[PDB]
Every structure is written in C-alpha cells, then in structure tokens.
RNA sequence: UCUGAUGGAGGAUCGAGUUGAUACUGACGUGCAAAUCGUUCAUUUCAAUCACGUUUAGGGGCGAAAGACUAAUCGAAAAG
RNA sequence: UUGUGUUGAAGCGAAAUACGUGAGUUUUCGUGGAACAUCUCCCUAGUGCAGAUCUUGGUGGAAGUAGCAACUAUUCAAAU
RNA sequence: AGCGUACCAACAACCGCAUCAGGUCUCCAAGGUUAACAGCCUCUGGUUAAAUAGAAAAAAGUAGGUAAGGGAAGUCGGCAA
RNA sequence: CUUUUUCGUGAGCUGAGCUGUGAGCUAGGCAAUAGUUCUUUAACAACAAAAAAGAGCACAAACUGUAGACGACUUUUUUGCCUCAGGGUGCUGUAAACAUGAAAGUAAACUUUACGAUCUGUUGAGGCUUAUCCCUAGUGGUAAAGUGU
C-alpha cells in the first residue's frame, strides 16, 4: 500500500554512480558554445586550491535589507601560475562524434611537461618528445593547413607549471582549452602566435566575471548510508544497529532497485559547479595583492603563517567568491560560462574594502607579523 | 662500521596510537628507524634505552630521544642503539 | 501535664557480602554457557542464609499453590 | 552333466569393426594372485534398488570461509 | 593397635561431553582515605596468564563519552540516559 | 615458337634517342592423347625454414596522503625527498631555581632566628606546535637491485 506520509527521496540520482573519479584532474564535459563574432579567446584555465579567507565588501543592492552596509564573504584562493601553451588539436564533426584530425606540437616542451608521460621519470632516460620535435616547418604548416581546411573545433594543449607552486608533484597537468571565437583561420593564427609562450590568468578571465569550476571533491572512503545519503537514523532500540535503511525495497520486484541508498564510496567525486564570481585577480608582480583602497597596507594574499596544508602563494591567483570542491593542493579547472550571464549579480562590479590575512591556524588576531611584533614588543 | 648521533621525534611516531601502545610503539619505531638508517636488518636496543623509553609508563614516552647508533661487524653487520642523556634538545642535529 | 538526657525495642530503614532476578524486552543467541555476560534492580535480625546428615518414591511423594518440583525428563519420573 | 585354472581363476579399471531391442551376454588390454563355471536338464532362496527426513560407512560444495573478542599490558637483553 | 597422611580444591587437577567467562562448603585477613571487611591506590604473598599474534584503522556492530539552541515536540509508554 | 612489322607504358640515359612491357599485322610449322565422370586439388588469409634487399619502459622498492578496508589512486627518488634543527604561525598560561623578598598569624632569644596555604621578581615565562601546518642549496641520509615485456 501507499506511504503514510510522503517525503522526497534521499539524495540525487543525477550524480550516480557515486564511485571514485577516474582521474584527479577536473575534466570539462563540454566547452561553452562557440560564437563566431567574438575574437578568438581561451575558455578554460587550471589552478590549485590554496585555501580560503574572508573579505569585506560594500553591497549595492537597492531594496535589499543590506544595501549600503559592508558584509563579510568567504572566498577561495586559487593559485594560478601561468600555463604554457604547447600544442594544437583540431576536431572535425562526424556522425560518430568529434574526430581528431591531428595534433601538432611546439618546437620545445618543458621537462615538466614531459614528466607527465612517465611513471618513473627519475630512472628513465627521458626520451619522450625528443625526435618528433625536429619535424620540418613544411609538414607542420601542411598539417596546420589541413586543420584549417577541415576542422571545426580548435583546442590548445596547455600545461601547468607545478614548480612555481609549493606542490611536491613535479609532472605538469595537461589539458586542452577550446579556442572559442572567430573563424577557423583566425583561431589557428591566434593559437599559433602564442604556441610556446606563457598563458596568464589575466588573458583568460577578468575581474567580476562569473565562471564555473570543475574539480574532484574531497575523498572520504566508504561511508555509511546515513552520512552518504542523509537517511534518517533508526530508533535507539534497533536490534542489529540503527545506522541503516530499514526497508530496501518492496517484495516485488524481487530485486533491489538502483534507487535505494546503500553504503559505499563518499567523496572523491567529479563536480562541475556553476557561477563562482571572481572577486580579484591578484598578480605575482605586485606587493599589495591583498591590499584594498580602504586598507592601503602593504600585504600579500598568503595569510600570516602560510596557507595551512598548502604553502605560500607566490604566483598569480584569483579570489573566488564562495567555496570550491576539493582539498588543498587540488587541481581546479576554471571554465567560462556555457552562455554569458547577464544577471545583476553576474554584471555587478565588486568593490572590496578588506582582505583578511590573519593566521588561519588557530584564531589569529594580526594581519601581519610586523603588526604582531609591534604589539608584543621585545621578548626574551 | 660507523657511528651516528640522531634525535628521534617520538611524538610524531606515537601520535596516532592508543594509550596502552605508546611506549611499545615508540620502541618499535626506534628499531625500525635505526635499521633503515644503518641499512642493517639486525638492530639491538640497549636496556638503558628501553628503561628510558618506559620511564614514564606505557602512557607517555619522551617526545624526543637523543640516541647513538653504532655499526659492528659481527648478516655480518649489525647495529647497537644507545640512549644519550642530554640536558636539552634544542639545536641538536644529526651527525655522523 | 511538659522539657532534657539516658536506654536500646522492632518479622524498623539505608547498604556491601550472601541470597535472588526488576529493566534494558542490552549483549549473546553456529553462545564462554542446552540460561551465560554487563549495567540496573530486590534482599541483609529474621517466616533469614549455608553445609553435612536424615526422612517422604511414581497414580506415589512434596507443594506460603505455579500443575510447581521429584537428577537438562513431569497435566503422571526414569529403566527394562 | 562337461568343463576353465600358475603358460594366471574370481574380482576390478578402461574398452570392443562384437551380439541382442532390451535386461544383458561375450571378448580385448591392463591389474590381480587362487580359485571358477556349467545355457544339458532340474532343484532351491535371505535373489535384482534412486528415492523410504531409509540403516551403516566414507566424502563433498559451503571454505582457507565464519571464526580463534570477558578478565586494562606489555617491552629490552641474554640462555637453551 | 589398625587405617588416613602425596597433590588439586578450580586460577586447566571437581561437576557441567572440554584445559568450558558457569556452579561448588569453611578459617586467616596489612596500610592510606573513609562510617566502612565499600570503592580507589599500596606493602607481604601471587601474577604479568588467558583456543593466537602483527599491521592498518574505513563502513557496520558492540561497550562507552561529549554535544550549540530547544527540552519529551520522540515513543504504546520518558524505554535508555 | 619463328618471321614481316604497327601503336600504346616501365628501367637506365639525355622536352628527347634506346631496352623491357601491353595490344596488334603477315607468313610458317608445332603440342595436347592416361582408356567413361567421382572436387575441375585452381580462392583468400596466415605460418615455418632457407636465400636476396634495407633497420625503451613498466612492476617491485623506499617516499608521499590531495587516497584508502585490501587492491586501487596522488606523488617523489639528488636544485627532489626523508630526517632533525633553526625560523614562522599558533595552543596553553607565567616553568624549574633563587631572593636580611611578601604573607593571616604563630614561638624563641637577648632589636634577630624558625614555621607558613598563598603571592611577587627574574617570567607574555616554560612546555608543545604535523604526525595530514608553513619556510630554509641549514644537519645527516637517500638503501640490494629483484621481476615482466
């Protein structure tokens, strides 16, 4: 018979199977739809999760109970050292999907890039990408002309530079960033110009821009159905334990349905979250990356004492409004929105007044070590 | 054959273990560390070192122990581990 | 008649032990165990508890009475 | 009644250009090491098994699985 | 005069099919705190043994702790705490 | 197969001569035979031998902890990593010792000597701080090379 009382099901069936992700790197399922009018541009980037802080900003929402007050917002810091563009891939449309015509490489690729091709780079003799980089410019241009002739989707292979980060991992993270923009010829030329140089975050994104983040959630091993699906605990009197689903199906069908919550892996899932706004693109060069016009204090983003479990952000970075899936040191893919957003929130110009850099270990009371020593005075 | 003086941070080796296993875990860690460092499989702990590790009961061993590892020739090689009484541990590094 | 002591009565009270067994309808339920384990609980000067000895034997015994118990066997034991 | 056996009987394992429609019969090779048939006719019975939660004995899959959990706790060195 | 006189008395020597967390009568009886032969710790005596160990340490179980704000709305019932 | 020869393609030579090849023209003389059929052994792909010509990794190990029941996964293996130390950042809350120092008061000598919870100074001290914190071309170390292709 029917349920006495209705209530919605536990968890979403759209994120099944809740199995471990194939890879650690976030992977774009689909790039934003190409608009032929816009000039050619990159659509994606990759950084590493450094940590989180909070900022103070002035709201500009008329009719909102906040409006003219200064509110505190949680922000995630993503260390975005420039990538290197190393290759070009052309895709053509076939009834069986996208088919690669060819991928052409740059003349020089870093050992950081070549490391990704090895499980034991240290004891190998690093012969990868050694004799295929001496191809003549004639055949390179032939392949490029064929790509321009027949391909409809252009992507640029680019790789991160983990040496610029505090990461222990040395092999770079490689992906392909789809070039959205003008004609095929314009895309080809756009990527050919910067076929070997650095790609900073500033070229890909702008401040106050809404983006999407693709990354693998924090892992938790096997978790019970209570913590994995949110099912209700059984009463205290339950004979064989209470942390389980009581009925895992009706008598018929004489099977367990795939919609029934069970124990299993929790976390380490691939998630693509939409609409994280960029609050600031901090530059490696400047000494006041964490300063504001209402702060005028000379300070950088890294909190007093380092980013816990991460290190120090010595490179370009971006300050993302809100939270982002993954642990510290996790590679995080940033993607342009599938269609440009025109909402008030997406179009707003954030003007932050203060960026916190107190210690995130313990309860820090100082923004700078100079301030701490000034307050305490001389010691033993 | 060689002699080293090292400090072992026993706190980070017994950090996760239960109350009733901290001192034996510290002993096991000391043996394993000395064996790894000396590249020998047969390592003998001095009874005075055992006494020092157990001096405060199973519940807590010293956070750090300053210790002397000596290699001797009698498969053929082996190592002796000896406690070193120190008034402090600050500024005390590994030396060969 | 009242007040203060003294005195030390009672199938008086609390409570370990002993003797039991209220609840968790806990554990266990291919047990440590054909009735145990944990916590909780009842009981302790009396109709109290224990030992050994001794008496009552099967349509019989014994029963502060549940058809209870009478050698893991009881609305008629066990053996042939 | 008339036969086979140490130049290898019964039994058993695998079989067969074998016979039978079939219960079976008959052969071969191996193993075995001492008995065996009689279909000439007949007499006799404790005479034919897939089952009976059959009886006794042996052996499986389960499975290198459940498990080897009360009693706070072990360590260093030596001897044998 | 004759007979008994070793040893266990459960913790593996008894009865529970066993080297079974059960059962099984008596006597002696230290110190501290305390009302106390209670609980907790200690001296003499005894032991460091348990049908196993090592590592890891998630789910789940079991035996527990602690929880903001609310305070029986839970549940047959304040069961359990 | 021989001869008369014509027109198309390939080698080597220099738009071009020759040789091979394919398709032809004239003339000539030369063969098939297994007893009546038993699939008409006829295709394709592969393989072996012999001749002739040219043509690197992964696992394990140690490390890591973005991972984890075990596998698996993320890493590093000499500008790295592990270790200890120094520094930072925090947590707790002012260590031991010493003081003709204090201390409610007390007792014992002919104004000092003893006892004293506690307090003060040296002392925001001391201890701890990655084991899953941060920084350091700071110390010491970084081990046999075993397996598969």
Coordinates of C-alpha atoms in Angstrom, one line a residue, chain A:
Chain A
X1 CA 0.0 0.0 0.0
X2 CA 0.9 3.6 -0.2
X3 CA 3.3 5.5 2.1
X4 CA 1.5 7.0 5.1
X5 CA 3.5 10.2 4.7
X6 CA 5.3 11.5 1.7
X7 CA 8.8 13.0 1.7
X8 CA 11.3 13.5 -1.1
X9 CA 13.9 10.9 -1.8
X10 CA 17.3 10.9 -0.2
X11 CA 20.0 12.4 -2.5
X12 CA 20.0 13.0 -6.2
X13 CA 20.0 10.2 -8.8
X14 CA 21.7 12.6 -11.2
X15 CA 25.1 12.0 -9.6
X16 CA 25.2 8.3 -9.9
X17 CA 27.1 6.1 -9.6
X18 CA 28.7 7.6 -6.5
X19 CA 32.0 5.9 -7.5
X20 CA 35.6 7.3 -7.3
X21 CA 36.5 9.6 -10.1
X22 CA 38.8 8.2 -12.9
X23 CA 41.3 11.0 -12.5
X24 CA 42.4 13.6 -10.0
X25 CA 42.2 16.4 -12.6
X26 CA 38.9 18.1 -13.3
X27 CA 37.7 17.4 -16.9
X28 CA 35.5 19.7 -18.9
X29 CA 32.5 17.7 -20.1
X30 CA 31.6 20.4 -22.6
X31 CA 33.0 23.7 -23.5
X32 CA 30.9 26.9 -24.0
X33 CA 29.2 27.1 -27.3
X34 CA 31.3 28.9 -29.9
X35 CA 30.2 32.3 -31.0
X36 CA 31.8 33.3 -34.4
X37 CA 31.5 37.0 -33.6
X38 CA 33.8 37.3 -30.6
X39 CA 37.6 37.5 -31.3
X40 CA 39.4 34.2 -30.6
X41 CA 39.9 33.6 -26.9
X42 CA 40.7 30.9 -24.4
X43 CA 37.9 29.3 -22.5
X44 CA 39.5 27.5 -19.6
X45 CA 42.3 27.5 -17.1
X46 CA 43.7 25.4 -14.3
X47 CA 44.9 26.4 -10.9
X48 CA 45.5 24.8 -7.5
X49 CA 43.4 25.3 -4.3
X50 CA 45.4 27.2 -1.8
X51 CA 42.8 27.8 0.9
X52 CA 40.1 30.3 1.9
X53 CA 39.9 33.7 3.6
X54 CA 37.2 36.2 4.0
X55 CA 36.7 39.7 2.6
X56 CA 34.7 42.8 3.4
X57 CA 32.7 44.4 0.5
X58 CA 30.1 47.1 0.1
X59 CA 26.7 45.9 -1.2
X60 CA 24.9 47.7 -4.0
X61 CA 21.5 46.0 -4.0
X62 CA 18.7 48.6 -3.9
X63 CA 15.8 47.4 -1.9
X64 CA 17.9 44.7 -0.1
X65 CA 18.0 44.7 3.6
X66 CA 21.8 45.0 3.3
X67 CA 22.2 47.5 0.5
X68 CA 24.6 50.1 1.9
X69 CA 26.4 48.0 4.5
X70 CA 29.7 46.3 4.5
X71 CA 29.3 42.5 4.6
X72 CA 31.8 39.7 5.1
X73 CA 32.1 37.0 2.4
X74 CA 34.0 33.7 2.3
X75 CA 36.5 33.4 -0.6
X76 CA 38.6 30.7 -2.0
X77 CA 42.2 31.4 -3.2
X78 CA 43.2 29.6 -6.4
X79 CA 46.9 29.9 -7.1
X80 CA 47.1 30.3 -10.9
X81 CA 50.6 30.3 -12.1
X82 CA 50.7 30.8 -15.9
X83 CA 50.4 27.8 -18.1
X84 CA 52.5 27.0 -21.2
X85 CA 50.7 26.5 -24.5
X86 CA 52.5 23.5 -26.1
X87 CA 50.1 22.1 -28.7
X88 CA 47.2 22.4 -31.1
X89 CA 44.4 19.8 -31.7
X90 CA 41.8 20.1 -34.4
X91 CA 38.5 18.3 -34.3
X92 CA 36.0 17.7 -37.1
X93 CA 32.4 16.8 -36.8
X94 CA 31.4 13.3 -37.8
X95 CA 28.1 11.3 -37.2
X96 CA 30.2 9.3 -34.6
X97 CA 31.2 12.5 -32.7
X98 CA 34.2 14.7 -32.7
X99 CA 37.2 13.1 -34.5
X100 CA 40.7 14.4 -34.1
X101 CA 42.3 15.3 -37.4
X102 CA 45.8 15.8 -35.9
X103 CA 47.6 17.4 -33.1
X104 CA 50.7 19.5 -33.8
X105 CA 53.3 20.4 -31.1
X106 CA 55.5 23.3 -30.3
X107 CA 59.2 23.2 -31.0
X108 CA 60.2 23.0 -27.4
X109 CA 58.4 21.4 -24.4
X110 CA 59.4 21.6 -20.8
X111 CA 60.7 18.7 -18.8
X112 CA 57.7 19.5 -16.5
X113 CA 55.5 18.6 -19.5
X114 CA 57.5 15.5 -20.5
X115 CA 57.3 14.2 -16.9
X116 CA 53.5 13.6 -17.3
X117 CA 54.3 10.9 -19.8
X118 CA 56.4 8.8 -17.3
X119 CA 55.6 6.8 -14.2
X120 CA 59.3 6.6 -13.4
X121 CA 60.9 9.7 -14.9
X122 CA 63.8 9.6 -12.5
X123 CA 65.2 6.3 -13.7
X124 CA 64.2 6.6 -17.3
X125 CA 66.3 8.5 -19.8
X126 CA 63.6 10.9 -20.8
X127 CA 63.5 10.1 -24.5
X128 CA 59.9 11.3 -24.8
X129 CA 59.3 14.2 -27.2
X130 CA 63.0 14.1 -28.4
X131 CA 62.9 13.1 -32.1
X132 CA 59.4 14.2 -33.0
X133 CA 60.2 17.9 -32.3
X134 CA 62.6 18.1 -35.3
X135 CA 59.8 17.9 -37.9
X136 CA 60.2 20.4 -40.7
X137 CA 58.2 23.5 -40.9
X138 CA 56.8 22.4 -44.3
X139 CA 55.0 19.4 -42.8
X140 CA 54.0 21.4 -39.7
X141 CA 52.3 24.0 -42.0
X142 CA 50.8 21.3 -44.1
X143 CA 49.1 19.8 -41.0
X144 CA 48.0 23.3 -39.9
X145 CA 46.5 24.0 -43.3
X146 CA 44.6 20.7 -43.2
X147 CA 43.3 21.6 -39.7
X148 CA 42.2 25.0 -41.0
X149 CA 40.5 23.4 -44.0
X150 CA 38.6 20.5 -42.4
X151 CA 38.4 21.0 -38.7
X152 CA 35.6 22.9 -37.0
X153 CA 36.7 22.9 -33.3
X154 CA 40.2 24.1 -32.3
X155 CA 41.7 23.3 -28.9
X156 CA 45.1 24.4 -27.5
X157 CA 47.0 21.9 -25.4
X158 CA 48.5 23.7 -22.4
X159 CA 50.1 22.6 -19.2
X160 CA 50.5 24.0 -15.7
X161 CA 53.9 24.7 -14.1
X162 CA 53.9 22.9 -10.7
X163 CA 57.4 24.0 -9.9
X164 CA 56.1 27.6 -9.4
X165 CA 53.8 26.2 -6.7
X166 CA 54.7 24.6 -3.4
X167 CA 53.4 21.2 -4.7
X168 CA 55.6 18.1 -4.3
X169 CA 54.3 16.8 -7.6
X170 CA 56.6 17.7 -10.5
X171 CA 54.9 16.4 -13.5
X172 CA 52.7 19.1 -15.1
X173 CA 48.9 18.8 -15.5
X174 CA 48.0 18.9 -19.2
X175 CA 44.7 19.7 -20.7
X176 CA 43.2 21.2 -23.9
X177 CA 41.4 24.6 -23.7
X178 CA 38.9 25.0 -26.5
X179 CA 39.5 28.2 -28.6
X180 CA 36.2 29.9 -29.0
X181 CA 35.9 32.9 -31.2
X182 CA 36.3 33.9 -34.8
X183 CA 36.8 31.8 -37.9
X184 CA 38.9 28.7 -38.1
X185 CA 41.8 30.6 -39.7
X186 CA 41.6 33.3 -37.0
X187 CA 41.7 30.6 -34.3
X188 CA 44.6 28.9 -36.0
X189 CA 46.6 32.2 -36.1
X190 CA 45.6 33.2 -32.6
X191 CA 47.0 30.0 -31.1
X192 CA 50.0 29.9 -33.5
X193 CA 51.2 33.3 -32.2
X194 CA 51.2 32.0 -28.6
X195 CA 52.2 28.5 -29.5
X196 CA 55.1 28.5 -26.9
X197 CA 54.6 31.4 -24.5
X198 CA 53.0 31.6 -21.1
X199 CA 49.2 32.0 -20.7
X200 CA 48.4 34.0 -17.6
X201 CA 45.0 34.0 -15.9
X202 CA 44.6 37.7 -16.9
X203 CA 44.3 36.8 -20.5
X204 CA 41.6 34.1 -19.9
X205 CA 39.5 35.8 -17.3
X206 CA 38.5 39.2 -16.0
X207 CA 37.6 40.5 -12.5
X208 CA 33.9 40.5 -11.6
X209 CA 33.3 37.6 -14.0
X210 CA 31.1 34.6 -13.3
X211 CA 32.9 31.3 -14.1
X212 CA 32.4 27.6 -13.5
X213 CA 34.7 25.3 -11.5
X214 CA 35.4 21.7 -12.3
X215 CA 37.2 19.6 -9.7
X216 CA 37.2 16.4 -7.7
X217 CA 35.6 16.5 -4.3
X218 CA 37.3 15.7 -1.1
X219 CA 37.5 12.0 -0.5
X220 CA 36.1 10.1 2.5
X221 CA 36.5 6.4 1.7
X222 CA 33.5 4.2 2.3
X223 CA 30.7 5.9 4.3
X224 CA 27.5 4.6 5.7
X225 CA 24.2 5.2 4.2
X226 CA 23.4 7.8 6.9
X227 CA 26.4 10.0 6.0
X228 CA 26.4 9.2 2.3
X229 CA 22.7 9.7 1.5
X230 CA 21.3 11.5 4.6
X231 CA 18.9 8.8 5.5
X232 CA 17.3 9.0 9.0
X233 CA 18.8 7.1 11.9
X234 CA 16.7 4.3 13.2
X235 CA 15.4 4.5 16.8
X236 CA 17.8 3.6 19.6
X237 CA 16.1 0.3 20.3
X238 CA 17.0 -1.2 16.9
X239 CA 18.4 -4.7 17.4
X240 CA 21.2 -5.0 14.8
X241 CA 22.2 -1.3 14.7
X242 CA 20.5 1.9 13.7
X243 CA 22.7 3.4 11.0
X244 CA 21.0 1.9 8.0
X245 CA 18.0 1.9 5.7
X246 CA 15.2 -0.3 7.2
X247 CA 13.4 -1.4 4.0
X248 CA 15.5 -1.7 0.9
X249 CA 12.5 -2.4 -1.3
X250 CA 9.1 -3.9 -1.6
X251 CA 8.7 -7.6 -2.1
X252 CA 8.1 -7.0 -5.7
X253 CA 10.1 -6.5 -7.9
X254 CA 12.1 -9.4 -6.3
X255 CA 15.2 -7.3 -6.6
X256 CA 16.9 -4.3 -5.0
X257 CA 16.4 -1.2 -7.1
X258 CA 19.3 1.0 -8.0
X259 CA 17.5 4.0 -6.4
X260 CA 17.9 2.5 -2.9
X261 CA 20.7 4.2 -0.9
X262 CA 23.5 1.9 0.2
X263 CA 26.9 2.1 1.8
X264 CA 29.8 2.9 -0.4
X265 CA 32.4 5.4 -1.5
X266 CA 31.7 9.0 -0.5
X267 CA 33.6 11.9 -1.9
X268 CA 36.4 12.0 -4.5
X269 CA 33.6 12.8 -7.0
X270 CA 33.8 14.9 -10.1
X271 CA 31.7 18.0 -9.7
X272 CA 31.1 21.0 -12.0
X273 CA 29.7 23.9 -10.0
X274 CA 28.4 27.0 -11.8
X275 CA 28.6 30.7 -11.1
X276 CA 31.6 31.4 -8.8
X277 CA 32.3 35.1 -9.2
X278 CA 35.9 36.3 -9.5
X279 CA 36.5 38.9 -6.8
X280 CA 40.1 39.8 -7.6
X281 CA 42.9 38.6 -9.9
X282 CA 46.0 39.1 -7.8
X283 CA 49.3 39.5 -9.6
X284 CA 52.6 37.9 -8.7
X285 CA 54.5 41.1 -9.5
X286 CA 52.7 43.5 -7.1
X287 CA 53.5 43.7 -3.4
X288 CA 49.9 44.7 -2.4
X289 CA 47.9 41.9 -3.9
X290 CA 45.8 41.6 -0.7
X291 CA 45.5 45.4 -0.2
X292 CA 42.4 47.4 -0.9
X293 CA 41.7 51.1 -1.4
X294 CA 40.4 51.2 2.2
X295 CA 43.4 49.3 3.6
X296 CA 46.5 50.9 2.0
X297 CA 48.5 48.3 3.9
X298 CA 51.4 46.6 2.0
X299 CA 50.5 42.9 2.2
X300 CA 50.1 39.9 0.0
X301 CA 47.4 37.2 -0.1
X302 CA 49.2 34.5 1.9
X303 CA 47.8 34.5 5.4
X304 CA 50.2 35.2 8.3
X305 CA 51.9 31.8 8.8
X306 CA 51.3 30.3 5.3
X307 CA 48.2 28.7 3.8
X308 CA 47.5 25.7 6.0
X309 CA 48.4 22.4 4.4
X310 CA 49.3 24.2 1.2
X311 CA 52.2 26.7 1.4
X312 CA 52.7 30.2 0.2
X313 CA 51.0 31.7 -2.9
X314 CA 54.0 33.2 -4.8
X315 CA 52.3 33.5 -8.2
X316 CA 49.2 34.9 -9.8
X317 CA 46.0 33.9 -8.1
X318 CA 42.3 34.6 -8.2
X319 CA 39.9 35.2 -5.3
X320 CA 36.7 33.3 -5.9
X321 CA 33.5 34.2 -4.2
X322 CA 32.3 31.2 -2.2
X323 CA 33.7 27.6 -1.9
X324 CA 35.1 25.2 -4.4
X325 CA 35.1 21.4 -4.4
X326 CA 38.3 19.6 -3.5
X327 CA 41.0 19.6 -0.8
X328 CA 44.0 21.9 -0.6
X329 CA 46.6 21.4 -3.4
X330 CA 43.8 20.1 -5.6
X331 CA 44.0 20.9 -9.3
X332 CA 40.9 23.0 -10.2
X333 CA 39.7 23.8 -13.7
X334 CA 38.1 27.1 -14.3
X335 CA 35.8 27.4 -17.3
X336 CA 34.0 30.3 -18.9
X337 CA 30.2 30.1 -18.5
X338 CA 28.4 28.0 -21.1
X339 CA 26.4 31.1 -22.1
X340 CA 27.4 34.6 -20.9
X341 CA 25.5 35.6 -17.8
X342 CA 23.6 38.9 -17.9
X343 CA 22.1 38.9 -14.4
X344 CA 22.6 41.7 -12.0
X345 CA 24.8 39.6 -9.8
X346 CA 27.0 38.5 -12.8
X347 CA 27.2 42.0 -14.0
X348 CA 28.0 43.7 -10.7
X349 CA 31.4 45.3 -10.0
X350 CA 32.6 44.0 -6.7
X351 CA 34.5 46.7 -4.7
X352 CA 36.1 45.0 -1.7
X353 CA 37.3 47.0 1.3
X354 CA 39.3 44.5 3.3
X355 CA 41.0 41.1 2.7
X356 CA 41.8 39.1 5.8
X357 CA 45.3 37.6 6.1
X358 CA 45.4 36.7 9.8
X359 CA 46.6 33.3 10.7
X360 CA 44.2 30.5 9.6
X361 CA 45.9 28.3 12.1
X362 CA 44.2 29.0 15.4
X363 CA 42.5 32.3 15.9
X364 CA 44.8 34.9 14.5
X365 CA 44.5 38.5 15.8
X366 CA 47.0 40.1 13.5
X367 CA 47.2 40.7 9.8
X368 CA 51.0 40.9 9.6
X369 CA 54.0 39.6 11.5
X370 CA 55.2 43.2 11.8
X371 CA 52.0 44.0 13.5
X372 CA 52.3 41.1 15.9
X373 CA 55.9 42.0 16.9
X374 CA 54.9 45.7 17.2
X375 CA 52.0 44.7 19.5
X376 CA 54.0 42.4 21.7
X377 CA 57.2 44.4 22.0
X378 CA 60.5 42.8 22.9
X379 CA 60.6 39.4 24.4
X380 CA 63.2 37.1 25.8

